Design a binder for this molecule. Structure first.
Ligand SMILES: CCCCCCc1sc(N)nc1C(=O)O
Ligand SMILES: [Zn+2]
Ligand SMILES: [Zn+2]
Length: 231
């Protein structure tokens, strides 16, 4: 069973096996007087591990590495953050101090700087405009356009048809858009469409928060955004 927010005390991290050599990681953190769960991804990269996003904080991120070493035992050597926001780049300085080379799009780096967040070391080239894809070890990065934020990437794992949607994709449970300050509610339904066309083989879809689903999570989001654009 997939771990839910009430089962993860803040400062602990869980690892969930999605497919051979593909895990998600789950943590919890306070935002505005509530606690929420957050997902990220882990992909075997030959003898190494590629990390997708932090565990939303330095202490959570430290616990992430410790779980990885207990449960998997291969080093995390690279990390990709999928947008700027404490829940994707919070912990980058911990990762760096452990020896992890951290990566983000230059739009993502720019925005983390403006906002006071931690900034990954290395700039990902090749993701400037919507539709762009770039291969990154065992995964393909893909920028579909604005959505949850303007810089936000998704990640597909081709060996296993796993699609990591980051905060641009909601879980069915979720029926409200929540906090969309930095969002493009106009382009958002677009960028989902660009996702659906690019990854129709997706067997597993993971949102930035809550329960993994299938490609229905795409449409489920779209709607939820609209209801917030209409009403
Ligand atoms: C499954 C619960 C969903 C509510 C989450 C609200 C938060 S907190 C945070 N750091 N990000 C978000 C987001 O929407 O991306
Ligand atoms: Zn965000
Ligand atoms: Zn988020």
């Amino acid at each position: 069973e997939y771990p839910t927010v009430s089962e993860i005390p803040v400062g602990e991290v869980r690892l969930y096996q999605i497919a051979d050599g593909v895990w998600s990681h789950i943590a919890t953190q306070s935002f505005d007087g509530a606690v929420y769960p957050s997902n990220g991804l882990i992909v075997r990269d030959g003898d190494e591990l590629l990390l997708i996003d932090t565990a939303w904080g330095a202490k959570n991120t430290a616990a992430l590495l410790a779980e990885i070493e207990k449960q998997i035992g291969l080093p995390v050597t690279r990390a990709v953050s999928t947008h700027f926001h404490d829940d994707r780049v919070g912990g980058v300085d911990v990762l760096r101090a452990a020896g992890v080379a951290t990566y983000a799009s230059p739009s993502t780096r720019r925005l983390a700087e403006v906002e006071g967040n931690e900034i990954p070391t290395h700039s990902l080239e090749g993701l400037s405009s919507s539709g762009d894809a770039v291969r990154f070890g065992p995964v393909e990065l893909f920028y579909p356009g604005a959505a949850h934020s303007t810089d936000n990437l998704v990640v597909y794992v081709p060996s296993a048809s796993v699609l990591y949607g980051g905060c641009a994709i909601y879980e069915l449970s979720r029926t409200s858009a929540g906090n969309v300050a930095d969002a493009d509610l106009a382009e958002w339904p677009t960028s989902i469409e660009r996702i659906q066309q690019h990854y129709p083989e997706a067997q597993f879809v993971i949102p930035g928060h809550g329960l993994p689903g299938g490609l229905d999570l795409l449409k489920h989001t779209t709607n939820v955004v609209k209801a917030h654009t209409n009403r």
